[PDB]
Design a protein around this ligand. Structure first.
Ligand SMILES: [Mg+2]
Ligand SMILES: [Mg+2]
Ligand SMILES: [Mg+2]
Length: 458
RNA sequence: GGGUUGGCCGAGCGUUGCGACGCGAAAGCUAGCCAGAUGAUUGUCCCACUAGCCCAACAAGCUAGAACGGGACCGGUUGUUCCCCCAACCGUAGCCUAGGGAGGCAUGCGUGACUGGUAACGGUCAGGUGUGAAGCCCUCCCGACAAUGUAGCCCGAACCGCAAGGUUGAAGCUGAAUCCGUGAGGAGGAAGCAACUUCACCAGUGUCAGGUGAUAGGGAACUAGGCUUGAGGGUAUGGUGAGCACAUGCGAAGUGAUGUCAGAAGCCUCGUCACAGACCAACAGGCCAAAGACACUGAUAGGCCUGAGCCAAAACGGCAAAUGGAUAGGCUACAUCGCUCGCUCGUCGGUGUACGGGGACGUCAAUCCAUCGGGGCACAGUCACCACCUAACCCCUCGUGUCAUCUGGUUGGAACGCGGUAAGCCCGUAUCCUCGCCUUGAACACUCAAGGCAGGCAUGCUGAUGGGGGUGCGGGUAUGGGAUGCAGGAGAAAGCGAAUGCCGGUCUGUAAUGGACCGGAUAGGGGUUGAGGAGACAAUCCAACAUCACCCCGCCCGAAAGGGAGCAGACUUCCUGCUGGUCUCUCUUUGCGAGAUAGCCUGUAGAACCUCUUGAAUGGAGACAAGGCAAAUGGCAGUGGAACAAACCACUGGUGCGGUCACCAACCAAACGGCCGUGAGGUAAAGAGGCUGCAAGUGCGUAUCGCAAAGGCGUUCGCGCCGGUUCCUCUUGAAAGAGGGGCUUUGAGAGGCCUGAGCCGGAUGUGGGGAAACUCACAAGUCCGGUUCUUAGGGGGCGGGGAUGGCAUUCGUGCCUCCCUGCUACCC
């Protein structure tokens, strides 16, 4: 009976087991890990967690080369019982090109809906290990962290007067296949047999180290985490070799930058990193990695960092505003005619992500010059669907007044009951700029203490 | 490094009523041409000259007249601000057109009335409203004066209480006397008329003066037009050499290069943090004690200026503002541009070209151009070469007229006017072939029927007091810009006793549609009338080819009813067949890149899986430690709290095999007074059957998958190049771009569709633009002829007729809703 298990305690019990394994690895035992993570993944009430996770979040409709698809409320009952380590083989992958408006067919392989449960079950009992052995200054696909905190550790490491003055950008080029299959058999402590079965078949080639998208791991829950374990370290190794030349490191999944003390320092830092990239098989490109003076700046994440005189301020980068002026322009070309309730409905959510993603930087000026340059598009859109009428007319037609600047886009229509309705553009810029509060570096959301962070902070 | 506010030059053409074909037979409208009649041929005076008078017939002094004789003048423009001279063109007259009013008329749309008719289908007046034109309305009245519209430029005020009423002033508009001139014209402006609302501030504060900025609205200039002496020759700064697609073209319609969404050309904004500002806020470097008049707070209190730069202080404060430059004075003419559909206009703004002689005043503004750089605009064209038509200004000849209007002729065209019921359909009638039925007041489902088939007709009613069907007649009704074409049939207006059709020849040009010539056919009789010639004026038929005015016979089809007759038969309709192109969808096909499961065999592990065989080498409860391993395990088991205890809250747990430890249950291979006992030595082990997992093969590149089915140029006689398609590589944020390996290609079947944009050549017209050529519109102007493109579906934009009226307030104009209700030519 699937509709009988109490989900109100599933999370509690699984989280309790995860806390146990985390606190265990906190002590240098390493043996108790492969007795709780062998007990969790071979029991009820955690196995159903994977099925529940995989059946939702889409991706449970289109199958791999099996035909089978659960999609129901009673076929996912013998699926639970059919999850055994003994007698397991994979069923390759079917390459399906996901359509794109631009036509950018991005190859995303897809596994079976029973195979996917295993990839989503073993993510448990491996996730607690990754958090406990993380790199302190590592962000990306972690729990409770946000991509804004990567800029957070820049008002501090680089913010004060002296700090550092030279930065190294760097970028790794290898795809997920280049990782040595032998190497992965000896470090990730999930299992020494299932992992061997997995790689040899497919499960690879899917994309580069991390998903191309920012929040859509459609099918794979293990792929992000393996990268965050193979690319770990790199911080104790960095600070042990070079002692006092004020070195530091940040990394948001990919896209990691290192602050040196002088150009001389950042010539062996590109060597000690190079040594710690051959034990795996993926190296750094000799085309894009540059050492940059701080007064010229660099493009890290969707942000730009520079120093003007004696002043640190980080502002929206040039090749990210231009994208936002290309996504809008291509929604006013496919939806030219529209009905004026589709212009507002389509262009509203588009101007909310680009506002949330820069809500915490010095961008009050940048939010202007980025609404006018769309205002001169709506108005030019308005006078192209009335090639005969006059200006005063198009104006009184699609521009209203609210009790403010009398010229805003919208329609002051009504409702069924005789109430004055309203619709209008967000007009990015009416967003209180907030200075974020950084996450403590050593925070670990699975240790039994420090439970007041994260959940309450969310 | 945080709060808030800004954005726009206007008006029409491309978007509704009629559109077929035959004929101007009469009237109206209109284009050339041909000849006349009448007007006009545009400032004022002198010198005329034009004649006349009878000024005697002047050397006459008078009326008055002509576009083109000569002087002297006045007014308005242009020749870069203003003054003084000079040169140039133009006027106050006559006549139309654009525009504004007043009537009738035809028509749209609906509301009432009286009626024509069996019933289909209609008619006649009065009420309310739209429309009367780039093709398509009639008489009057204004008529270059006007209404309109705006980016630039002006005003948009003082005033005193006086309850806001006047005194003003006023951007400006009308402008009378008065005087000087002969006169056109000058100097002077008596008297009137006029928008004048709303705020925000000028070293805080509470105070008075002076000032500043933006708007409600008014004003100036322009909007406000044309012709009034020609013809010829040369002269582009004026235009044209389709259209549409694209790797290769179609087509009759230049040759070339480049470009089509990561965008050529053109344009708007800003300078390396790269939209114009301004207020507060905070921070920093500075300045005056409140900086025009007066208590009021105040100096570890203020205020202000400058700041993502400087200086300077109460000044008109100055500097350079990506690199490099030019510059005086513009209600002027022309061409171009003001952030993208083509064409006309109107105000305003900068560029480029052209624009007399002196003198006076005194230039420069973050104004402008050229180059680089950053961010934006999209309905796809740009740039050179060649060939041709045109000649306003320019130069050279020959001119004596030119413009408008009205008459009388001639040739024409039409959306204006007149003629045509016909096959479809509706109704009436006649007759005939009829005959199908669930029940049925029944002669017993078979004769006077309802529920009610059907039909008529939303149970709502007649309804075997009946149904059904073609056929011959008789009334009424069609509503008509091209969209694959063709062929016969029902029908056939206008013309013909020889024709502008039709049929056969000749001949000529267009890409296609043509024009001029010859031949060829082409009607059953009989009777009145002469409608008008002619016979004149009495003396004749036409006896009606006056396309047949009116009756009888035969002729053919119909039950009569009476309908029809020689070749032609234009346009719109209903029928038959063939033929064509566009769609959607189920099949198969091969070329690409993925690709297992089942099943069968080949070697292996069972310690955590069973059943065993063995003589035993076995059965239980415990303790520690663990970068060894695993066949259902933690929907579990605990403690302390909700005292405990029901949920509820915290904390604890390594699940088994193997490692080290030890304990209890039977050993008797040990010792061994042979068994007649005593202590004590280990509880080790190996083969068999399925059962499962691993590494392999076969099952197979099979099912199952994702995309795709495009070729063209010369055979240098290989192949090359330009493309298409699929798979893989680096690239940035990108749909773009590059570099490689493959192929470069098949047939059926089911169901739909036939609507619209243009462009080209001649023939008839018209209105804008223009001097002319040409240009953009009139359903693609219409017609005809030759061509390419486009057909679910949205979004917007109009119009007509009514309702209770909601609102704002002009109090009866508009925003609105509620349907009815035509429009899509317009963008995806
Ligand atoms: Mg049109
Ligand atoms: Mg006609
Ligand atoms: Mg059309």
């Amino acid at each position: 009976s699937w509709h009988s298990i109490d989900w109100a305690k599933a999370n509690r019990e699984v989280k309790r087991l995860q806390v146990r394994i985390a606190k265990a690895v906190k002590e240098g035992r390493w043996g108790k890990v492969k007795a709780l993570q062998w007990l969790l993944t071979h029991s009820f009430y955690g196995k159903a967690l994977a099925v529940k996770r995989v059946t939702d979040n889409s991706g449970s409709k289109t199958p791999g080369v099996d035909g089978i698809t659960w999609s129901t409320q009673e076929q996912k009952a013998q699926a639970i019982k059919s999850l055994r380590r003994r007698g397991y083989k994979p069923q390759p992958l079917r390459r399906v090109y996901i359509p794109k408006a631009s036509g950018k067919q991005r190859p995303l392989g897809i596994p079976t809906t029973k195979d996917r449960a295993m990839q989503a079950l073993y993510a448990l009992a491996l996730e607690p290990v990754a958090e406990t052995t993380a790199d302190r200054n590592s962000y990306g696909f972690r729990q409770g962290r946000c991509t804004a905190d990567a800029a957070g550790q820049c008002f501090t490491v680089l913010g004060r007067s002296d700090c550092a003055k030279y930065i190294l950008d760097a970028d790794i080029t290898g795809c997920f296949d280049n990782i040595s299959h032998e190497w992965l058999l000896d470090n990730i402590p999930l299992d020494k047999e299932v992992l061997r079965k997995w790689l040899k078949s497919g499960f690879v080639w899917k994309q580069q180290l991390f998903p191309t998208h920012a929040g859509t791991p459609q099918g794979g829950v293990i792929s992000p985490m393996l990268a965050n374990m193979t690319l770990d370290g790199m911080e104790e190794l960095l600070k042990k070799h070079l002692r006092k030349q004020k070195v530091n490191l940040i990394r948001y999944a990919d896209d990691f930058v290192v602050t040196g003390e002088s150009k001389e320092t950042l010539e062996k830092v590109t060597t000690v990193i190079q040594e710690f990239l051959k034990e795996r098989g993926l190296t750094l490109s000799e085309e894009k990695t540059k050492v940059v003076h701080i007064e010229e700046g660099f493009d890290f994440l969707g942000w730009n960092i520079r120093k003007y005189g004696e002043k640190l301020l980080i502002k929206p980068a040039k090749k990210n505003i231009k994208a936002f002026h290309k996504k809008i322009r291509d929604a006013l070309k496919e939806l030219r005619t529209a009905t004026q309730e589709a212009v507002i409905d389509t262009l509203n959510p588009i101007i909310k992500g680009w506002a949330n993603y820069h809500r915490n930087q010095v961008s009050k000026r940048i939010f202007n010059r980025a609404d006018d340059n769309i205002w001169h598009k709506l108005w030019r859109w308005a006078k192209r669907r009335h090639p005969n009428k006059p200006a005063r007319w198009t104006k009184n037609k699609y521009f209203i007044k609210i009790g403010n600047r009398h010229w805003v886009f919208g329609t002051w229509k009504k409702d069924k009951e005789g109430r004055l309705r309203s619709r209008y553009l967000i007009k990015a810029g009416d967003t209180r700029i907030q200075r974020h509060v950084k996450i403590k570096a050593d925070a670990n959301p699975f240790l039994p203490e420090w439970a007041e962070y994260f959940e309450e902070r969310k």
